[PDB]
């Protein structure tokens, strides 16, 4: 049905030594063969990371890309390049990009369309702030964010959506399995109206925001929770626990 | 004396193969002793670049870094990682970051201070637009940009300043060696007052903005032009021509 999907977002963390260690832990670990795991290291380590991977279920993605393959854009990363080195994914629209780097919805829509055109999968990030939450605006907010992508992307076969409440990112204040499931269901319902049911049925909608080796297990029966996008826990042994949480 | 410094700004360009060819060429060609060459590839290729270089004159640098070494800054580059992988420089303040990515003088200052603090050299870009130039603000502008840095930074041992008129970047409209020579000396003056004589006298000030194999030579006898920061041409053979430009 929808394959369980776990993404590891290392953020700006790592060394060859630490990366080595993570990747090797993955190569060695016992994980169901019906899982899709993606680790996302700093661009500096995409190549290296791709080289250490000796597990079929493990694939590397980048943490961000520009909306052109090549050109006069000093300091950016290209989808063509992350792919050249072996990566298969790219996280677009992450919250950290959104607030700090002023990445607007349109911008992320242009980047998604692009990467997808170049044949890389996309982990598209969406989610509300404590303030949009409190104001009952969670769903408008996510529908705003997705609509901007939908205007551009017609084929979502290679998109994985990761709903991540802004207020749950790295705070340890995760959404409850219950709230997450309903939000996911609503998102999914929203999308079916736009992409058809076959497509929304096959789409993975991960939960992200303080997902750890402990609470992962409590989301195990939530039908519209298809996996996680893990920040802090991705760099800990406990990441393997996340992977097996439905095992 | 000041050692001729040539910087190669790949911008969003390269493949392992195209980078292999560039580096192998640097490796092959007759280049001066006492030249200082820094090739700056996309972050995706830093490590590989560094493993290809065989030439002691050639260093690898990155195109951008954030102002903190580690953290929840999805998609950014760390000075610690570029270093880990063996690059020795970072380009900070490039007009492309200044314009497309809304990077302001402060951010750039903060970035310059951190980078140095972690012991990576900085290639600090400064420059005026067509407007500012036409209006005779060029010194104004660059003194501005430089002071923002001066205020956080004090020891410029490891800084190289790249004066790059915005109107010359990738347009094919290079400054005249006269103008350039003029502008560098003023800037040098200015820094001597703030950084003292010795400092200002050992600090390389580069010219960038359509510096190519054809005109690199026309700057040969300009005392205050210590080298170049090359964009388009760094991808080309004529790059080694720029390095050998000082007869």
Swiss-Prot record, chains A, B:
User: What reaction does this enzyme carry out catalytically?
Assistant: D-glyceraldehyde 3-phosphate = dihydroxyacetone phosphate
Family classification: Belongs to the triosephosphate isomerase family.
The taxonomy runs: Eukaryota, Fungi, Dikarya, Ascomycota, Saccharomycotina
> What are the Phosphoserine sites (modified residues) in this protein?
70, 214
Q: Does the keyword Transmembrane apply?
A: no
User: What protein name does the entry list?
Assistant: Triosephosphate isomerase
Entry annotation: catalytic residues: 94 (electrophile), 164 (proton acceptor)
Which Gene3D superfamilies is this protein grouped with? Answer: Aldolase class I
Q: Keywords assigned by UniProt?
A: Gluconeogenesis, Glycolysis, Isomerase, Isopeptide bond, Phosphoprotein, Ubl conjugation
Pathway membership = Carbohydrate biosynthesis; gluconeogenesis; Carbohydrate degradation; glycolysis; D-glyceraldehyde 3-phosphate from glycerone phosphate: step 1/1
Reported EC number(s) for this entry are: 5.3.1.1
**UniProt binding sites for substrate:** 9, 11
* One GO BP: glyceraldehyde-3-phosphate biosynthetic process
Gene symbol here is: TPI1
Q: Does the record bear Ubl conjugation in its keywords?
A: yes
Q: Which Pfam families match?
A: TIM
Q: What else is known?
A: Present with 207000 molecules/cell in log phase SD medium.
């Amino acid at each position: 049905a929808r394959t369980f999907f776990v993404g590891g977002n290392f953020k700006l963390n790592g060394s060859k030594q630490s990366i080595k260690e993570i990747v090797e832990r993955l190569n060695t670990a016992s994980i169901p063969e019906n899982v899709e795991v993606v680790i996302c290291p700093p661009a500096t380590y995409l190549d290296y990371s791709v080289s250490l991977v000796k597990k079929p279920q493990v694939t590397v993605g980048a943490q961000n890309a520009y909306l052109k393959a090549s050109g006069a854009f000093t300091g950016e990363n290209s989808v063509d390049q992350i792919k050249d080195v072996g990566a298969k994914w790219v996280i677009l629209g992450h919250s950290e990009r959104r607030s700090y780097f002023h990445e607007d919805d349109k911008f992320i829509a242009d980047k998604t369309k692009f990467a997808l055109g170049q044949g890389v999968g996309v982990i598209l990030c969406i989610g509300e702030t404590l303030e949009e939450k409190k104001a009952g605006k969670t769903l408008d907010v996510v529908e705003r964010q997705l609509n901007a992508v939908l205007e551009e992307v017609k084929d979502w076969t290679n998109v994985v959506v990761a709903y991540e409440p802004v207020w749950a990112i790295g705070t340890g204040l995760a959404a409850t399995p219950e709230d997450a499931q309903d939000i996911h269901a609503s998102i999914r319902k929203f999308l079916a109206s736009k992409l058809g049911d076959k497509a929304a049925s096959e789409l993975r909608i991960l939960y992200g925001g303080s997902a750890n080796g402990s609470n992962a297990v409590t989301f195990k029966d939530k039908a519209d929770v298809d996996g996680f996008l893990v920040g802090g826990a991705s760099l800990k042994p406990e990441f393997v626990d996340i992977i097996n949480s439905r095992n």
